[PDB]
Amino acid sequence: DEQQSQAVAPVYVGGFLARYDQSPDEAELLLPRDVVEHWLHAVALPLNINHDDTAVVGHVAAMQSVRDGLFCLGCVTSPRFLEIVRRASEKSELVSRGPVSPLQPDKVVEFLSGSYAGLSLSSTPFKEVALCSVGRRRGTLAVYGRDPEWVTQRFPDLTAADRDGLRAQWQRSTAVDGDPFRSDSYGLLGNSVDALYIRERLPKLRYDKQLVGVTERESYVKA
Amino acid sequence: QAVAPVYVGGFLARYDQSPDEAELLLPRDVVEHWLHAVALPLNINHDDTAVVGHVAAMQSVRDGLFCLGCVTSPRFLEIVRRASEKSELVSRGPVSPLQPDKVVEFLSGSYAGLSLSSRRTPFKEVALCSVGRRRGTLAVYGRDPEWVTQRFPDLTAADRDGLRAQWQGDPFRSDSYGLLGNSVDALYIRERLPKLRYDKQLVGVTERESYVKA
């Protein structure tokens, strides 16, 4: 209970929604810097599971256009979603194996890291942000952690100035969040089988990890 | 209807396949000895709190050990039913002729392999798993046990008669959460799809005439 209480504390997620250096084969995935800045530069977008309106699990706490792409920081807050994740994490051998040495085991964070390893922006233009098994845009690796600062520190490309801009954002009471989640374990279970048949899933995830340099520092990423 | 029984068939071992593991070896003779040549429980990934049914028949044939299982647990079937309604893969349906069967399709996609762990004393249990450690252990699901057996070209009428003679309280103590945890594990099994496709080719089953998803 006490230890289970920590499991369902909020979970932050960060990562690029798009990499300006990545040229996609599909026109639909194009998202140039000028386009992003226009709508972005010159209010809190919901965060969900695979773009499902009934699976809102939190909100976006910061969005920043940087040198290498569009970076996002979200916050998973749904008590229902986190409890579901807590229970499944207890029956995962992947999770039982734990994280890389120095990191403290964190079943909930590890389960999220394993299942929803990608970030997905889709559509105002900026409608919402989705956690998915793997993103269609390359470099969209999802990085989970209990601390916003820690998550941002997982990406070598971000400079101290970049992080300052992001911080000003998350430090600022959202409309999306009682519990915005309107799905269940059965729903998540149905989605898990879909993930099993995504082709090149692991190679895509490993490619993303190297592209954003998360391979350089320790994290809960399972890929 | 959807939660009616589901049969699953497939080889638990291919005598022609050389187990890249000395512990997975399973010679014909040792098999036929324990065989005819208490029905074994059928569970999920060898979790004994996840028994979904029983083995209805086993037959040692030319190419290996063929098995036919029956998924009967109502608790399990109902859990599967709900999840199947929230699966895009399942919503896409099967290939042309075959009629949609959500529960059968979710099972085909999630537990595409069979696993025997006679580890020990003889045959202990058969597990439905995302992919088996032994090659050629593709799991084929269906509502009619006859149809399922007809999915494997290797089997002969004589082989089928032997199996036919055999197949002719809720034991599940798990939940949606347990299956979900197992689902993330499956995502990290290496070469899952390549192995499944290999198994599929080996036993001659096609997505074009079954519910197999790999």
Short mmCIF file of N, CA and C in Angstrom, two decimals, chain B residues 9-16 59-68 113-116 134-140 152-155 159 199 202-205:
data_model
loop_
_atom_site.label_atom_id
_atom_site.label_comp_id
_atom_site.label_asym_id
_atom_site.label_seq_id
_atom_site.Cartn_x
_atom_site.Cartn_y
_atom_site.Cartn_z
N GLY B 9 -4.69 -26.47 -32.12
CA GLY B 9 -3.90 -27.61 -32.50
C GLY B 9 -2.52 -27.21 -32.98
N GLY B 10 -1.63 -28.18 -33.07
CA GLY B 10 -0.29 -27.89 -33.53
C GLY B 10 0.70 -28.88 -32.96
N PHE B 11 1.91 -28.87 -33.51
CA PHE B 11 2.95 -29.76 -33.05
C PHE B 11 3.61 -29.17 -31.82
N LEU B 12 3.87 -30.03 -30.84
CA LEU B 12 4.54 -29.60 -29.62
C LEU B 12 6.03 -29.81 -29.84
N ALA B 13 6.35 -30.50 -30.94
CA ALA B 13 7.74 -30.80 -31.30
C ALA B 13 7.83 -31.41 -32.69
N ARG B 14 8.88 -31.04 -33.41
CA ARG B 14 9.13 -31.55 -34.75
C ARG B 14 10.40 -32.40 -34.70
N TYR B 15 10.25 -33.71 -34.89
CA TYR B 15 11.39 -34.62 -34.83
C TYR B 15 12.51 -34.25 -35.80
N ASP B 16 12.16 -33.57 -36.88
CA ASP B 16 13.12 -33.16 -37.90
C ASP B 16 13.92 -31.92 -37.51
N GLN B 59 -1.05 -37.07 -30.48
CA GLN B 59 -0.74 -38.13 -31.44
C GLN B 59 0.68 -38.01 -31.97
N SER B 60 1.43 -39.10 -31.89
CA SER B 60 2.78 -39.10 -32.42
C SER B 60 2.61 -39.44 -33.89
N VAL B 61 3.08 -38.55 -34.76
CA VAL B 61 2.94 -38.77 -36.19
C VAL B 61 4.31 -38.76 -36.86
N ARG B 62 4.34 -38.93 -38.17
CA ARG B 62 5.61 -38.96 -38.89
C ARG B 62 6.56 -37.81 -38.55
N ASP B 63 6.05 -36.59 -38.62
CA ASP B 63 6.87 -35.40 -38.38
C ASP B 63 7.08 -34.93 -36.95
N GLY B 64 6.30 -35.46 -36.01
CA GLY B 64 6.47 -35.05 -34.63
C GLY B 64 5.31 -35.38 -33.73
N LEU B 65 5.18 -34.61 -32.66
CA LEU B 65 4.11 -34.80 -31.70
C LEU B 65 3.02 -33.76 -31.89
N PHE B 66 1.87 -34.20 -32.41
CA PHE B 66 0.76 -33.29 -32.63
C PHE B 66 -0.16 -33.28 -31.41
N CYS B 67 -0.68 -32.10 -31.10
CA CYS B 67 -1.55 -31.92 -29.95
C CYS B 67 -2.81 -31.16 -30.34
N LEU B 68 -3.88 -31.40 -29.60
CA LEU B 68 -5.12 -30.69 -29.84
C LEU B 68 -5.64 -30.29 -28.46
N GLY B 113 1.99 -19.56 -30.33
CA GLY B 113 2.80 -20.75 -30.16
C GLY B 113 2.35 -21.71 -29.07
N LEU B 114 2.86 -22.94 -29.13
CA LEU B 114 2.54 -23.98 -28.18
C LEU B 114 3.82 -24.40 -27.48
N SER B 115 3.72 -24.77 -26.20
CA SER B 115 4.90 -25.17 -25.45
C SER B 115 4.65 -26.32 -24.49
N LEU B 116 5.42 -27.39 -24.64
CA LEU B 116 5.32 -28.55 -23.76
C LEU B 116 6.49 -28.50 -22.80
N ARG B 134 10.64 -24.30 -29.20
CA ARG B 134 10.94 -25.33 -30.20
C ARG B 134 10.30 -24.83 -31.49
N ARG B 135 10.96 -25.05 -32.62
CA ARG B 135 10.43 -24.59 -33.90
C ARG B 135 9.38 -25.54 -34.47
N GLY B 136 8.40 -24.97 -35.16
CA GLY B 136 7.32 -25.76 -35.73
C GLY B 136 6.14 -25.88 -34.78
N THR B 137 6.17 -25.14 -33.68
CA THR B 137 5.10 -25.21 -32.69
C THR B 137 4.01 -24.15 -32.83
N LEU B 138 3.69 -23.80 -34.07
CA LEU B 138 2.66 -22.81 -34.35
C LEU B 138 1.32 -23.29 -33.79
N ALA B 139 0.57 -22.39 -33.17
CA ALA B 139 -0.74 -22.74 -32.63
C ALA B 139 -1.84 -22.32 -33.62
N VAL B 140 -2.75 -23.24 -33.93
CA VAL B 140 -3.84 -22.94 -34.86
C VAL B 140 -5.18 -23.06 -34.13
N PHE B 152 -3.26 -28.72 -41.07
CA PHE B 152 -1.90 -29.22 -41.21
C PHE B 152 -1.81 -30.30 -42.28
N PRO B 153 -1.23 -29.97 -43.45
CA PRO B 153 -1.07 -30.88 -44.59
C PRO B 153 -0.32 -32.17 -44.27
N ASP B 154 0.55 -32.12 -43.26
CA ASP B 154 1.34 -33.29 -42.88
C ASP B 154 0.50 -34.43 -42.33
N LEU B 155 -0.60 -34.09 -41.65
CA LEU B 155 -1.45 -35.12 -41.06
C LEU B 155 -2.19 -35.96 -42.10
N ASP B 159 -3.91 -40.43 -39.17
CA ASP B 159 -3.47 -39.58 -38.07
C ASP B 159 -4.70 -38.91 -37.44
N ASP B 199 7.99 -21.28 -38.42
CA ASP B 199 7.14 -22.37 -37.97
C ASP B 199 5.97 -22.55 -38.94
N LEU B 202 7.14 -24.22 -42.01
CA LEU B 202 7.46 -25.61 -41.68
C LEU B 202 6.26 -26.55 -41.61
N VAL B 203 5.16 -26.11 -41.01
CA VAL B 203 3.99 -26.98 -40.90
C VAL B 203 2.95 -26.77 -42.00
N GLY B 204 3.30 -25.98 -43.01
CA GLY B 204 2.41 -25.74 -44.14
C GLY B 204 1.09 -25.03 -43.92
N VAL B 205 0.98 -24.23 -42.86
CA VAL B 205 -0.26 -23.51 -42.60
C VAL B 205 -0.17 -22.12 -43.22
#
